[PDB]
């Protein structure tokens, strides 16, 4: 399934019927937060 | 050979519209015809409010633009030929004339 950059590989299971193919190919990388940069506070 | 001829006058200029209405009324009266009106409908005020700036900077100031349309209704109890002859009189620009029956 194309996610805008790559074709994520999946195998269809009986429990995924009636669902969209988009639901199994995440289009974004989950966010892991680094230390805040300059300008995050003192606003 | 008598019918209720409906005359609708539409213009943006109140002076020109009123002058045309008065001319039509006097022309109808000169022919001993029965004249009902003019009936002045509520003025139609087309309003547009747009931001003055061509961009998003500065205090949000708005320009209120209005276009006023004035409508008049005149009813004549006479024949098509006579109403046509009356309406043949010169009409200044900006005034729209519509003649119908009922």
């Amino acid at each position: 399934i194309y996610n805008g950059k790559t074709f994520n590989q999946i195998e269809v299971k009986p429990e995924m019927i009636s669902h969209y193919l988009a639901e199994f190919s995440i289009s974004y990388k989950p966010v892991k937060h680094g230390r805040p940069g300059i300008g995050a506070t003192h606003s | 050979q008598i019918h209720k001829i409906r005359i609708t006058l539409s213009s943006k200029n109140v002076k020109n519209l009123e002058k045309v209405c008065a001319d039509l009324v006097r022309g109808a009266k000169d022919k001993r015809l029965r004249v009902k009106g003019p009936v002045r409908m509520p003025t139609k005020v087309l309003n547009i409010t747009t931001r003055k700036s061509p961009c998003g900077e500065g205090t949000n100031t708005w320009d209120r633009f209005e276009l006023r349309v004035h409508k008049r209704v005149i009813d004549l109890f006479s024949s098509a030929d006579v109403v046509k002859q009356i309406t043949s009189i010169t009409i200044e620009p900006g005034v729209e004339v519509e003649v119908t029956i009922a």
Binding site: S43 | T49, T59, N60, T61, W62
Partner: protein, 141 residues
């Protein structure tokens, strides 16, 4: 020839018209007796022109009141103003000017709004704020 007058009271956008003619002394608004006018709290304002003058002066006139526009309070204020003006005009045009002046004086001594419309009107709102004078909250940082 019919003996009648028609007088209008105003308050904001509320317009009330009282048709007062010769009769046995009934008073109805939109076909409903004035005693059932709503809200019940404003019945005092509705009846003030009647309480000040007495029912005897109204005993010889039938009044039909038609109201439109405005809100609950404005309609009642227009109703009372129209009632007062209609009674004054009827007394002027069918009753001695002395009695007309007396009723006008008693009404005005209690309240001038019973015969003079309040000219207050809603102020147009200006851009840059929610209200006519209220402006959007200002922030500097």
């Amino acid at each position: 020839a019919v003996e009648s007058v028609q007088c209008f009271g105003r308050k904001k956008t509320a317009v009330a018209v009282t048709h007062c003619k010769r009769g046995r002394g009934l008073i109805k608004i939109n076909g409903v007796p004035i005693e059932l006018v709503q809200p019940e709290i404003l019945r005092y304002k509705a009846f003030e022109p009647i309480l000040l003058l007495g029912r005897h002066r109204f005993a010889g006139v039938d009044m039909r009141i038609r109201v439109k526009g405005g809100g609950h309070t404005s309609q009642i204020y227009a109703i009372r103003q129209s009632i007062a003006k209609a009674l004054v005009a009827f007394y002027q045009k069918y009753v001695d000017e002395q009695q007309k002046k007396e009723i006008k004086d008693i009404l005005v001594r209690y309240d001038r709004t019973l015969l003079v419309a309040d000219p207050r009107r809603c102020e147009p709102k200006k851009f840059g704020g929610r209200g006519a004078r209220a402006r959007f909250q200002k922030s500097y940082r």
